[PDB]
Amino acid sequence: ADYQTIYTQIQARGPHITVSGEWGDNDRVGKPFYSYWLGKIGDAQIGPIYLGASGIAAFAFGSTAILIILFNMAAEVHFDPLQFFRQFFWLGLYPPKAQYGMGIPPLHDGGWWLMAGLFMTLSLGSWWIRVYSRARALGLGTHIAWNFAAAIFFVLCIGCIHPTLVGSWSEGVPFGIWPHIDWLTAFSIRYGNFYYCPWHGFSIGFAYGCGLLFAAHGATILAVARFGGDREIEQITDRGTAVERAALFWRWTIGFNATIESVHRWGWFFSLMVMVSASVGILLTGTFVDNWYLWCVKHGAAPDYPAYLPATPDPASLPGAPK
Amino acid sequence: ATEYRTASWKLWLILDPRRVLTALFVYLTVIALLIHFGLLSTDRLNWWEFQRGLPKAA
Amino acid sequence: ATEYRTASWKLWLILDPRRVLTALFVYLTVIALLIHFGLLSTDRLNWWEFQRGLPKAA
Amino acid sequence: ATEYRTASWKLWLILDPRRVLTALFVYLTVIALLIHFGLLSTDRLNWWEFQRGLPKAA
Amino acid sequence: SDWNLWVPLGILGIPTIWIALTYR
Amino acid sequence: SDWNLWVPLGILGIPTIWIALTYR
Amino acid sequence: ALLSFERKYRVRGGTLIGGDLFDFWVGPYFVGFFGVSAIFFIFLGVSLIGYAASQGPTWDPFAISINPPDLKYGLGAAPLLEGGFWQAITVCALGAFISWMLREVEISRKLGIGWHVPLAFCVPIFMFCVLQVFRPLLLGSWGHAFPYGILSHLDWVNNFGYQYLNWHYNPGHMSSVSFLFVNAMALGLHGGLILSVANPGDGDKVKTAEHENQYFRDVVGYSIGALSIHRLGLFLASNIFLTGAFGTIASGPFWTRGWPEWWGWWLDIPFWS
Amino acid sequence: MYHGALAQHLDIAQLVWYAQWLVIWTVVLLYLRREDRREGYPLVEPLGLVKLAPEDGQVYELPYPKTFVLPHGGTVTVPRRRPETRELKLAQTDGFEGAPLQPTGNPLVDAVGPASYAERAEVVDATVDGKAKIVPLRVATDFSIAEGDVDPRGLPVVAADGVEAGTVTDLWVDRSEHYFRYLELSVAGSARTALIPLGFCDVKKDKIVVTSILSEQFANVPRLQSRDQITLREEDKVSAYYAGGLLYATPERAESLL
Amino acid sequence: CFEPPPATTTQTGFRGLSMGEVLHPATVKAKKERDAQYPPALAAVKAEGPPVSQVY
Ligand code: BCB
Ligand code: BCB
Ligand code: BCB
Ligand code: BCB
Ligand SMILES: C/C=C1/c2cc3[nH]c4c(c3C)C(=O)[C@H](C(=O)OC)c4c3nc(cc4[nH]c(cc(n2)[C@@H]1C)c(C(C)=O)c4C)[C@@H](C)[C@@H]3CCC(=O)OC/C=C(\C)CCC[C@H](C)CCC[C@@H](C)CCCC(C)C
Ligand SMILES: C/C=C1/c2cc3[nH]c4c(c3C)C(=O)[C@H](C(=O)OC)c4c3nc(cc4[nH]c(cc(n2)[C@@H]1C)c(C(C)=O)c4C)[C@@H](C)[C@@H]3CCC(=O)OC/C=C(\C)CCC[C@H](C)CCC[C@@H](C)CCCC(C)C
Ligand SMILES: CC(C)=CCC/C(C)=C/CC/C(C)=C\CC/C(C)=C/CC/C(C)=C/CC/C(C)=C\CC/C(C)=C/CC/C(C)=C/CC/C(C)=C/CC1=C(C)C(=O)c2ccccc2C1=O
Ligand SMILES: COC1=C(OC)C(=O)C(C/C=C(/C)CC/C=C(/C)CC/C=C(\C)CC/C=C(\C)CC/C=C(/C)CC/C=C(\C)CC/C=C(\C)CC/C=C(\C)CCC=C(C)C)=C(C)C1=O
Ligand SMILES: COC1=C(OC)C(=O)C(C/C=C(/C)CC/C=C(\C)CC/C=C(\C)CC/C=C(\C)CC/C=C(/C)CC/C=C(\C)CC/C=C(\C)CC/C=C(/C)CCC=C(C)C)=C(C)C1=O
Ligand SMILES: CC(C)=CCC/C(C)=C/C=C/C(C)=C/C=C/C(C)=C/C=C\C=C(C)\C=C\C=C(/C)CC/C=C(\C)CCCC(C)C
Ligand SMILES: CCCCCCCCCCCC[N+](C)(C)[O-]
Ligand SMILES: CCCCCCCCCCCC[N+](C)(C)[O-]
């Protein structure tokens, strides 16, 4: 085979050059070290890191959040250290279990949930700023920041916005491995099956889309790596045989192609759209649709199947039923 | 070698004390924890708690 | 060789003490663990607990 | 050949002791484990536990 | 007690011998 | 107390001796 | 009909099967032997869907469905309307897929590029095969496969997953899901990063490769490097299905309890139980 | 009475649905697809009938031009009109639109099909400092191989025949990526070094195996202009030569398997 | 842990929907053995004499 696409056979070492920012060249932190193993898939060098304010802040809120989360998880196993470690995935920080509408709930029932929520929110933001500022610091464009934005917004939607529009904190996602997942099912059951929500559709489309696209783009570049097609930026400004082939390949197959530059747009667009599509769906849910299946039936989208075993009338609705 | 009987010691020319030291430190620590906690998760041989072992009693 | 009978020793020219050592360390530790825990998971052959065995008793 | 009979030995010119050695090591270990645990998962031929076999009894 | 059943002995033993003798 | 249950001693002991004697 | 640079590349040869007779382009499409074959399946398979859907009970595009045969039919053929057409299409499907993939091989041969693309395309094909073919073989019926139908297919996914009591816990799934997410995020970053360097805003000069590196080594303190991201993308993408395929095949043939119960192995290690 | 009901059958969800669609398509069409036509358009025609306009809907098609201001001076405008004026040594099988072409002479030297290169700017690729990006390890003395790898310097280069083509002189490094791009070997029989892309050779413990081309055709790998630096065009030239050999080394590489 | 094949399967809803039960044949056997200790019916007796209310 061609081994040079899978891993790197002969590794290189030498002096790395620092691009001086607009500001905060000073707030780079740590002794850069190498990993020979890591060097077989990517660059081996691992430090330094930029610090600065946004960072500081993000960590600040982030940690507080984490602390509140974990601490409460411990409190669930009554602080038994052995049990904690065994039961860890099953432990969580839950939102309120009674109906208080949108009132700040008691500490012991959802209160702590809410606090961690707010702090997680704040870290996300601080981080956002990091991403956005750094870009501007180095004279790049802001695309990453905007993609990241959408992601954050979707977190907001399922965290507080949706709860708000229906007006109960009870609808919040809980913190914890298994329990954040149990949420998914509950939430779906409640809103009459999410497979039937169109935005869930869209989203998934775009998500699989990403799969397809990365596999394709990924594969395409490696296929043309022999002509130095991995040098993607010089290819943009001075088109070489590499991407000429890459283009041709796709044109001869699906019958239209991209450019080396624009394929990146497509990917960036699909990525974004996952998060956006999602957000919409979440906003609509509870607010305008109560039961997504029934809704799909009102617009006759829903498939209907004959009975295999005899059809069963609901017993509640019989003459002389109990309760 | 200062009146040594074996060559044993040459091991440290082969092995690297810093690795050994550090490894034992960890190794031991873990075994130790396993034993402590593991014991304290039985009914007999749990000090720290009331004998809810209910040894044979009831 | 200093008064040897076999050439056994030449193994270490081939094989590397440090590997063998580090490996054995691990190997034995794992086995030791398996047995210990393994035993302590039975009914006969658990020290560390009240006789869960109900040996013939009922 | 220092009083040999066959050339069998030339195998190690071809094979590499270290590979053979290290593999046999693993191969055997696995079979060993297989048999041990295998046996200890039956009813006849479990030592380590009370005769669950209910050999004919019930 | 190994009576009538030399099966494993044969299986274990035989090779043991010819492994001894073939590769000298 | 090993009553014809020299079994583990057999497995433990035998090699112990030849490991002693073969690599000298 | 040609890109300005297209002509110098349009040369004969590098077909896998049957040489020169099929070696031509219709417009921008390269045909080849497998071109022809693909088309044939596509056309037949689609037509077959239509006819089949015509004798359904609806024509709402979401609501149309071609279901596989009952479980009683085993691994045999079913009446055409009672699951047979399902069978038909499934073959046209495979047909199309494979012809598609081989066509790609022919194309790449002609261009002197690597075969990474076709191969990559092989992964989903396999998963299709896993779900429609293998898993049903192992349970011994076609009736275990999924139906063709936009909403219909999801119903299959849905029930399947509740057959083990909470599919979220199935460890194959966990891995696959993780990849799905990482992949998406990573495409976003890769997308953005190139775009930022190329279109730096204002009359700022286009930046260098070093700026890509700097940027990430700032934000998260590591840069995977330019080639390798491509390599890595391909990897993430691919294990979506590679790992999942394990969880899928497992459910039924190798596990019949709820998926959560399976974590019992850890939850129940008797030491700390 | 219901939340989100615009009629007895019309609800706000339903409307949003279409809305969503609308946007998607718009972006796709009125944007993304335009952005795609920055290279190689407008379409060209060497058979068809009086056409200054692709698939119809599209001669707007091309977006208005960008202007990439380049890192080390100068501007590029996209889309462009970059004309191919190499005179291709390719005869047509038929005069037909989309019937394939036959090379007239040696395809590897005449640079056609998989052996064709793009006419890139005849300049050296640069670092952020203004040094040359791609250089050998005679020049980049600061750079080195990672401890734990095989130094290919000294090894025999074995070609497709099973015949030693020559011996490895050097590695060439990308200074801004810390990555090795080329082996520079000494083609035995002549007094010349030829540059092979590292993606065309399987490096072993003892030998470098080159499946791409035959031993005899190492003599004709494109010559470098300078000794210690490589232009962007020379890169494409070198790469295309070996890849072209994947279809043109032996006559059977043409043919189908049966 | 990785429970070996085959599986008993039934169908409980329309074809192609993936509805129905999935059993490990082994496990069923074990349960069936267990649910067999149900002691057999006692030998039926001839209804003869007065009602127990007058006897006891
Ligand atoms: C185990 C789980 C599976 C699954 C789970 C699943 C979920 C949960 C969802 C879908 C959705 C979708 N799935 Mg499914 N899926 C589909 C296709 C589809 C589309 C109807 C839609 C979006 C696909 C997409 O954008 O992907 C990426 C590819 C892109 C963007 C390129 C374009 C592809 C195009 C959108 C799909 C074209 C297919 C045609 C509509 C129908 C067939 C062809 C025609 C000519 C007969 C195909 C063709 C196949 C097979 C087997 O070939 C299949 C298998 C499966 N899906 C597995 C069974 N899929 C979503 C949906 O919309 O459901 C309502 C959805 O929510
Ligand atoms: C039984 C329930 C189901 C369900 C329930 C469901 C719900 C309720 C929702 C989705 C949603 C989605 N579902 Mg679905 N789902 C999907 C896939 C998807 C995603 C495309 C999309 C969720 C968006 C996302 O990517 O989240 C992952 C990305 C996230 C969460 C963003 C994270 C970014 C964030 C910045 C992360 C960084 C965090 C920091 C590091 C902080 C650290 C924390 C500290 C402070 C402690 C597939 C492919 C399938 C299949 C194949 O069946 C499926 C079936 C189901 N879903 C089952 C039917 N799903 C969402 C949606 O689209 O609804 C319309 C959604 O709301
Ligand atoms: C009812 C029966 C019991 C039983 C039956 C029993 C038997 C029959 C045996 C033991 C043995 C052992 N038992 Mg025991 N047991 C022990 C612990 C022990 C260990 C002291 C010893 C394990 C030696 C070993 O396996 O080597 C594992 C690892 C080794 C040897 C590594 C060192 C060698 C290495 C190759 C050399 C390299 C050293 C370098 C300096 C370091 C290199 C560093 C590297 C990483 C760079 C504990 C802590 C308990 C408790 C808490 O209840 C207990 C209860 C019981 N045991 C039950 C009461 N046990 C064994 C023994 O030999 O006693 C001493 C033994 O034969
Ligand atoms: C209640 C049930 C659930 C469920 C049941 C489930 C099952 C049973 C399976 C998955 C699987 C998967 N699930 Mg899960 N799922 C996932 C995500 C995923 C995917 C990562 C993974 C694989 C999808 C697949 O098989 O593609 C299918 C795509 C295929 C087969 C490729 C089709 C492409 C084809 C080769 C080419 C098609 C070309 C077109 C016909 C051409 C037409 C186009 C036009 C241009 C002509 C998420 C993110 C969620 C969330 C967020 O909750 C979720 C929830 C659920 N899943 C619910 C809990 N899921 C699969 C898995 O891996 O399980 C471990 C799987 O088997
Ligand atoms: C389709 C769109 C996709 C998408 C897109 C994008 N995603 C992005 C970006 C874009 C564009 C970024 O630019 C940004 C980034 O930069 O990446 C490079 C980012 C991010 N997405 C992350 C994770 C992620 N993305 C997910 C999903 C999707 N993303 C969706 C799918 C998921 C899922 C799916 O779950 C996950 C988990 C992080 C890497 C990063 C946030 C960092 C943060 O916000 O920091 C917040 C800071 C903290 C939490 C503080 C940490 C404190 C430590 C651990 C210590 C606590 C210990 C304490 C007890 C004691 C203190 C002592 C201490 C010293 C020990
Ligand atoms: C991890 C790997 C990822 C990945 C990778 C790659 N993906 C690739 C490639 C790579 C590398 C290509 O090289 C190839 C391609 O060309 O690039 C565009 C391709 C392609 N992936 C398509 C769709 C796609 N990728 C999906 C998934 C992933 N991709 C995963 C995530 C999904 C999901 C997830 O649903 C979809 C729908 C087509 C656009 C295209 C082939 C067209 C075709 O196949 O032609 C042949 C067939 C047709 C044009 C029509 C077939 C009609 C048949 C005969 C009968 C009707 C269909 C019947 C089966 C009913 C089912 C419908 C029902 C469910 C309601
Ligand atoms: C004129 C004349 C003589 C007529 C008589 C002749 C006649 C009638 C003859 C007989 C006809 C015959 C025999 C055959 C018909 C033709 C034929 C073979 C047809 C096959 C056609 C067919 C089935 C087409 C369908 C196309 C298809 C399957 C899918 C459409 C594409 C889709 C949905 C893609 C998913 C969306 C997607 C990922 C878009 C991505 C955008 C792009 C362009 C990605 C690709 C791409 C990537 C990924 C890069 O990395 C990249 C890197 C650098 C440069 C470029 C690219 C690039 O373009
Ligand atoms: C060049 O410009 C650019 C850069 O350089 C400037 C960048 O650095 C960057 C990006 C900057 C970065 C820092 C990139 C790093 C971003 C990331 C998201 C990297 C993180 C990746 C991971 C965390 C790995 C993912 C791991 C998980 C999600 C957890 C999964 C959990 C489990 C249990 C998985 C279990 C199974 C596995 C782990 C592996 C299973 C594998 C198999 C079963 C089979 C393996 C298949 C193969 C090996 C392929 C077959 C082999 C051959 C074909 C030879 C970009 C975007 C840009 O393009
Ligand atoms: C000239 O006209 C034609 C063309 O050019 C226009 C063609 O290209 C073609 C295409 C022909 C080719 C060989 C194309 C090149 C070959 C490939 C691309 C390989 C891929 C081909 C396939 C996967 C399948 C093609 C082979 C067949 C359809 C043969 C049919 C075999 C049988 C038994 C049909 C009779 C039905 C029964 C006996 C009932 C029992 C069988 C079942 C229930 C199986 C159905 C259930 C499944 C899950 C199918 C899975 C099994 C497979 C997909 C092989 C044809 C046919 C046509 O003649
Ligand atoms: C107006 C008023 C009063 C309040 C407004 C408050 C507000 C903004 C609420 C909104 C809250 C939001 C956005 C809540 C969002 C909650 C969400 C999305 C939770 C989702 C998932 C969380 C998961 C999966 C977390 C599990 C966490 C753990 C198992 C423990 C945390 C630990 C780690 C991640 C490891 C790091 C720790 C290590 C260094 C030791
Ligand atoms: C459900 C999400 C899928 C969104 C649709 C993706 C757009 C496919 C691109 C078609 C390109 C059309 N064309 C040939 C004019 O270029
Ligand atoms: C891909 C997701 C499937 C659900 C989409 C719902 C389709 C609505 C269009 C159907 C026309 C009927 N309607 C809305 C007027 O009642």
mmCIF file of N, CA and C in Angstrom, chain G residues 116-146:
data_model
loop_
_atom_site.group_PDB
_atom_site.id
_atom_site.type_symbol
_atom_site.label_atom_id
_atom_site.label_comp_id
_atom_site.label_asym_id
_atom_site.label_seq_id
_atom_site.Cartn_x
_atom_site.Cartn_y
_atom_site.Cartn_z
ATOM 1 N N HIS G 116 -8.699 6.062 -2.387
ATOM 2 C CA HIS G 116 -9.284 6.334 -1.109
ATOM 3 C C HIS G 116 -10.775 6.577 -1.210
ATOM 4 N N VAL G 117 -11.199 7.361 -2.197
ATOM 5 C CA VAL G 117 -12.615 7.695 -2.266
ATOM 6 C C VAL G 117 -13.498 6.436 -2.318
ATOM 7 N N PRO G 118 -13.318 5.563 -3.342
ATOM 8 C CA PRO G 118 -14.157 4.384 -3.466
ATOM 9 C C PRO G 118 -14.188 3.603 -2.190
ATOM 10 N N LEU G 119 -13.019 3.459 -1.592
ATOM 11 C CA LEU G 119 -12.909 2.623 -0.430
ATOM 12 C C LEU G 119 -13.685 3.184 0.700
ATOM 13 N N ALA G 120 -13.609 4.503 0.832
ATOM 14 C CA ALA G 120 -14.328 5.177 1.876
ATOM 15 C C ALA G 120 -15.813 4.935 1.729
ATOM 16 N N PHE G 121 -16.260 4.935 0.470
ATOM 17 C CA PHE G 121 -17.649 4.705 0.108
ATOM 18 C C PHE G 121 -18.054 3.279 0.370
ATOM 19 N N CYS G 122 -17.058 2.419 0.493
ATOM 20 C CA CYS G 122 -17.347 1.058 0.826
ATOM 21 C C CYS G 122 -17.927 0.905 2.255
ATOM 22 N N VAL G 123 -17.515 1.751 3.194
ATOM 23 C CA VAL G 123 -17.992 1.601 4.575
ATOM 24 C C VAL G 123 -19.514 1.634 4.709
ATOM 25 N N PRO G 124 -20.177 2.701 4.211
ATOM 26 C CA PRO G 124 -21.639 2.679 4.357
ATOM 27 C C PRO G 124 -22.265 1.503 3.645
ATOM 28 N N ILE G 125 -21.696 1.113 2.507
ATOM 29 C CA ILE G 125 -22.268 0.003 1.786
ATOM 30 C C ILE G 125 -22.325 -1.207 2.717
ATOM 31 N N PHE G 126 -21.256 -1.379 3.459
ATOM 32 C CA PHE G 126 -21.157 -2.495 4.345
ATOM 33 C C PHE G 126 -22.242 -2.493 5.435
ATOM 34 N N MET G 127 -22.459 -1.329 6.006
ATOM 35 C CA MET G 127 -23.428 -1.179 7.043
ATOM 36 C C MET G 127 -24.807 -1.567 6.472
ATOM 37 N N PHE G 128 -25.076 -1.158 5.219
ATOM 38 C CA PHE G 128 -26.343 -1.456 4.543
ATOM 39 C C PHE G 128 -26.529 -2.964 4.512
ATOM 40 N N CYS G 129 -25.485 -3.637 4.008
ATOM 41 C CA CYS G 129 -25.336 -5.089 3.947
ATOM 42 C C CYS G 129 -25.547 -5.743 5.324
ATOM 43 N N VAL G 130 -24.937 -5.167 6.362
ATOM 44 C CA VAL G 130 -25.076 -5.621 7.757
ATOM 45 C C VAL G 130 -26.515 -5.636 8.193
ATOM 46 N N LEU G 131 -27.225 -4.540 7.922
ATOM 47 C CA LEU G 131 -28.606 -4.375 8.373
ATOM 48 C C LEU G 131 -29.636 -5.154 7.553
ATOM 49 N N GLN G 132 -29.445 -5.170 6.226
ATOM 50 C CA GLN G 132 -30.384 -5.807 5.293
ATOM 51 C C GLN G 132 -30.110 -7.272 5.031
ATOM 52 N N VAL G 133 -28.913 -7.751 5.358
ATOM 53 C CA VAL G 133 -28.472 -9.067 4.889
ATOM 54 C C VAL G 133 -27.954 -10.005 5.983
ATOM 55 N N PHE G 134 -26.909 -9.569 6.661
ATOM 56 C CA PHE G 134 -26.264 -10.370 7.671
ATOM 57 C C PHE G 134 -27.113 -10.580 8.886
ATOM 58 N N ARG G 135 -27.468 -9.487 9.543
ATOM 59 C CA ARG G 135 -28.275 -9.596 10.719
ATOM 60 C C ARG G 135 -29.544 -10.418 10.434
ATOM 61 N N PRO G 136 -30.156 -10.228 9.250
ATOM 62 C CA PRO G 136 -31.321 -11.090 8.981
ATOM 63 C C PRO G 136 -30.944 -12.549 8.761
ATOM 64 N N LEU G 137 -29.812 -12.813 8.116
ATOM 65 C CA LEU G 137 -29.318 -14.184 8.027
ATOM 66 C C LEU G 137 -29.154 -14.826 9.351
ATOM 67 N N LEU G 138 -28.337 -14.217 10.199
ATOM 68 C CA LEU G 138 -28.165 -14.658 11.578
ATOM 69 C C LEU G 138 -29.438 -14.852 12.382
ATOM 70 N N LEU G 139 -30.509 -14.132 12.084
ATOM 71 C CA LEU G 139 -31.757 -14.439 12.771
ATOM 72 C C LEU G 139 -32.709 -15.270 11.906
ATOM 73 N N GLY G 140 -32.259 -15.548 10.679
ATOM 74 C CA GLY G 140 -32.937 -16.455 9.747
ATOM 75 C C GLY G 140 -34.249 -16.081 9.066
ATOM 76 N N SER G 141 -34.380 -14.825 8.664
ATOM 77 C CA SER G 141 -35.570 -14.325 8.001
ATOM 78 C C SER G 141 -35.214 -13.052 7.354
ATOM 79 N N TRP G 142 -35.897 -12.738 6.284
ATOM 80 C CA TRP G 142 -35.703 -11.419 5.766
ATOM 81 C C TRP G 142 -36.466 -10.407 6.581
ATOM 82 N N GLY G 143 -37.589 -10.853 7.134
ATOM 83 C CA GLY G 143 -38.456 -10.014 7.944
ATOM 84 C C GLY G 143 -37.786 -9.255 9.073
ATOM 85 N N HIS G 144 -36.491 -9.453 9.220
ATOM 86 C CA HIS G 144 -35.781 -8.736 10.219
ATOM 87 C C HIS G 144 -35.144 -7.493 9.676
ATOM 88 N N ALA G 145 -35.253 -7.278 8.369
ATOM 89 C CA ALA G 145 -34.610 -6.128 7.727
ATOM 90 C C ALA G 145 -35.505 -4.877 7.767
ATOM 91 N N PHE G 146 -35.017 -3.717 7.299
ATOM 92 C CA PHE G 146 -35.872 -2.534 7.349
ATOM 93 C C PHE G 146 -36.526 -2.206 6.054
#
